[PDB]
Amino acid sequence: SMEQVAMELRLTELTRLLRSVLDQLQDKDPARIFAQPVSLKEVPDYLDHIKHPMDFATMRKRLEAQGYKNLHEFEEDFDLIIDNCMKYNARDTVFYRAAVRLRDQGGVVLRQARREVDSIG
């Protein structure tokens, strides 16, 4: 149907916007601490601690399959990155501190993304 096509164009355009958001958030992680999944070879107990691991590569795979229906779903995955790190790692670690900085800097980006998603529809 033509309606299904229109919905698909909307999803495509959301995906374009989320790709730009993802690029901007990932620039706030210049150390690449959140770039890839935590390695279960290197941290074998991880899944005993963290039940829903997340990282920017995994988000990018979902994004490119157009698997984010709305901004809330995308933000859920970004918050997992941060929140997982802040639980597994202690306050005095470079990992925790990187997550705080990513949260703080990403907030700005996400605030305007929400306005754009609402504005453009």
| Sole residue written with tokens 């990018």 | 60
User: Which of 19, 52, 12, 54 has the alpha carbon at shortest distance from 35?
Assistant: 54
Q: What is the rounded CA–CA span in Å between residue 119 and residue 81? A: 27
| Sole residue written with tokens 């504005």 | 119
Q: Hey, where are the domains in the chain? A: 1-121
Q: What is the rounded CA–CA span in Å between residue 102 and residue 28? A: 6
H-assigned helices in 28-93 = 46-49, 56-64, 71-88
| Side-chain half-sphere exposure of 59, counting CA atoms within 13 A | 26
- CA 23, 65, 35: angle at the middle one, nearest 5? 40
What approach was used to elucidate this structure?
X-ray
Is residue 116 within 8 Å of 88, Cβ to Cβ? no
Show the tokens assigned to 111: 């605030």
Q: List the resolution, Å.
A: 1.5
Architecture of domain 1-121: Up-down Bundle (1.20)
Is residue 53 within 8 Å of 47, Cβ to Cβ? yes
Between the CA of residue 72 and those of 4, 5, 82, what are the distances in Å?
22, 23, 15
Handedness of CA 44, 46, 65, 82 (dihedral sign): negative
